[PDB]
User: Fold this.
Amino acid sequence: NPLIQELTQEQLRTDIPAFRPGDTVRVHAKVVEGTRERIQLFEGVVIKRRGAGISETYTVRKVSNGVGVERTFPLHTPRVAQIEVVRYGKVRRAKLYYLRALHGKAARIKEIRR
Amino acid sequence: MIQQESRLRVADNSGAREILTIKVLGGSGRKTANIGDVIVATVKQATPGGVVKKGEVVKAVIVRTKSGARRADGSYIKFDENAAVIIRDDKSPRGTRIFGPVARELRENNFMKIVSLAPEVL
RNA sequence: GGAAAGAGGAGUGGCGGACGGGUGAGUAACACGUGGGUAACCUACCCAUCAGAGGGGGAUAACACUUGG
RNA sequence: CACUGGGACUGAGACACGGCCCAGACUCCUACGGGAGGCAGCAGUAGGGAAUCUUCGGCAAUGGACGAAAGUCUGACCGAGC
RNA sequence: CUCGUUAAGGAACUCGGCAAAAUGACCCCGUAACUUCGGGAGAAGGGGUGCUGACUUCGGUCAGCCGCAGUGAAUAGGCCC
RNA sequence: GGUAGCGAAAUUCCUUGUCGGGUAAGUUCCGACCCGCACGAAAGGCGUAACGAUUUGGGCACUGUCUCAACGAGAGACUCG
RNA sequence: GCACCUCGAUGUCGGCUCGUCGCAUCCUGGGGCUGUAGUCGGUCCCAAGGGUUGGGCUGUUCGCCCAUUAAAGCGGCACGCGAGCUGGGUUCAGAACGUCGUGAGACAGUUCGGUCCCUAUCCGUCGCGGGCGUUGGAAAUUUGAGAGGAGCUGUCCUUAGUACGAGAGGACCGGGAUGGACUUACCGCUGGUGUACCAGUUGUUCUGCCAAGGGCAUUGCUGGGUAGCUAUGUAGGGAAGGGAUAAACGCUGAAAGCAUCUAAGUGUGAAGCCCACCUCAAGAUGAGAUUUCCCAUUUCUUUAAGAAAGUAAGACCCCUGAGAGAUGAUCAGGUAGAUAGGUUGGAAGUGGAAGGCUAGUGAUAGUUGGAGCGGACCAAUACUAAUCGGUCGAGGACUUAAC
Assistant:
């Protein structure tokens, strides 16, 4: 463990804001359309986070044009530029897998100040 | 992954609603299809009126699966549905409207007429 | 550079855009025709009459500079 | 009644014929992130049909909007063409 | 051998859906062809169900609270042509 | 010298008869046709609601039946008396 | 066709699982002829390395059909395989139809139903140990006689819209990119599981009661999940070459003044053959090689490759174990100590403990506080257990030659 952490230490990002599963987030991804570079945005609710080290990932749920979409990211990629927390949610567990079988108003998460 | 006798919704304006897969073209014993793969299928449910009528053998390309795709930078995408678009043997939609959102892998496989009409391209 | 007129430009504000012009798809009913009722009603511009028109405050477009397109 | 279907806002008066917002089908421009439109006004076009006209001139006259007024606007309308 | 769970697909298995899985309680709404008029009928298809307070005419209804889930365990029709 | 009714049938050899239906594809199934090897009226003919741990064909739901296998619990198996 | 063989018993077809062999070759490789312009083809010769698909209908082979593929080969092996599976079909006892028979009954006509036993002795096949040998006793590193695995193939881009051809159409020979099926490892990612991990919740019973908990109900049920084992996940592979050949094609050349690949001489030439790549291997009784370590008591049968005794180098018994495992073996350690348990910090994971406080009539909510708990994972630490001991294990033959 400590030989691996030392090698991988110099590649962890330091500008990562704190968030939990349940919060809403805007990810500033990076797309390459031929030679062009460009930035998209992907707005949704964080539903997963499974971790320990450079190997940390999270996933975001969204509903686009009547179909639900999920996108998982590593925490430390340089191919993301920004993670912004928009709201805070009141939640009671770590994996919000029950959201993937609800729609509209049943899938509502209450807000909370922090 | 989509195999023989899987059923797909249609994300097109062609007159078909449900489709049943018959073959997974390309190879000699290949099992499954993915996003950007071509297929031979039966129309199982049509719409009253429409260029395409029920009982027909036709070709379609997969967008939008549940077990989705993986990108080179370590990130993934997954959908809640399986869907396809009926195709005209040189990759053009036989309809004029695509519904719902579409995976970005259809660019690399060169369905450029379809990436023009999709509402969102993820 | 101090000059007063004539001719342009966008802006704030008033009034008009519910008229005039088109068509007959819907509609078997107070929709229309004819005869009445409202002690259950509204009405800018126009005409008449009576009475007012006091004294204060905080802004904003334009304009000038600047960001993303 | 105003491309099909819902809604309100401003206003004395509209749930509005060349206004706004949302949904739907159709058409169009895009650097893909997005944007634009509604002749059942007058001419005109393609299509359907046995079958039905000019992409004209002027506000001199009568009526209408605004302005104190000169005036500016008016495919209403007055004339010309087949 | 006897049990529990399983990504994506969902009878492509096999002589044959064999074996499994699924339905299952109570209250309310509804329910076709046909018929010997009794039936068919639990046809099919849908909704409610926990806890606290107030009122309760009576049987219940309103206000509020919590979880992924309220016949929160065990026991209990799959259906159609 | 076989009438009504029915007929590739629990009966039809040739035969997977021919035509329509259902499937992407149907020697099984359903509808019809009549050329009934070898139907036929109480060893009854032809219908028929209700019923069946009967026989057959098709749909929805559900699934380790299958693509194609993986993990876990217990009993035998394995070592010692 | 015959009746040698088996009647004190030799169990039929399709399917399943697992294959192997022949070549009269289905694809891929190499060629000669063409009534071969190019693109596609016809036919004959050489070639068995590898490859050769999923459904529908029938008990069905056979067959027809659908959608693909480079291709969807044909035979042998008790028409391979039931002490390995199935029992749909044929061929027991029940019942029915057509038909024959006076009848009892019958039909390679049909229909619905219908019991498949076996604890592996020997050889054989896959794995794993003990004994001795290899001529002093030991600890390691190895060569390779032999042997096994592997061996498939598509599409696009370029050469080039070039050669060819009226047009339509469209190459060889080279170079580059990316796939299908098959296969060797592995758990960082995406998922599965995860019965001594965390949480929620129903019924009833116990810890005297309240609060807080234990037992049982499939782990009572429901939502997550560490290590480990895993595919549908991730990485790699069948790369390029050399040698001798098959069909075929020569160069030089006479017998036979010419001609002729052949007799003497001399070449080219295939996915095939021997190497090249991977793994096993000196029980290869032909038992191979290199480096390092250790060096002499007592009586005599008679002196002899003699017996017996204590030892060296080294090894084992016994104990703590896991990266190993049915057992045994293998590997990590035994106080010259981190081998396993515990302790002290941490992590994954769960998701806000108990006891108080505050706001509510209450159910509950907020706060102290990313709290409490935490199997297998990571560091440190001799606190407990690896104590004390015993057993086995050399003294190196003879002949010839060179030094």
Notes: The first strand of chain B starts at residue 7 and ends at 10. The helical segments of chain B are 105-108. Residues 105-108 of chain B form the longest helix (4 residues). The two ends of chain B are 19 Å apart (CA to CA).
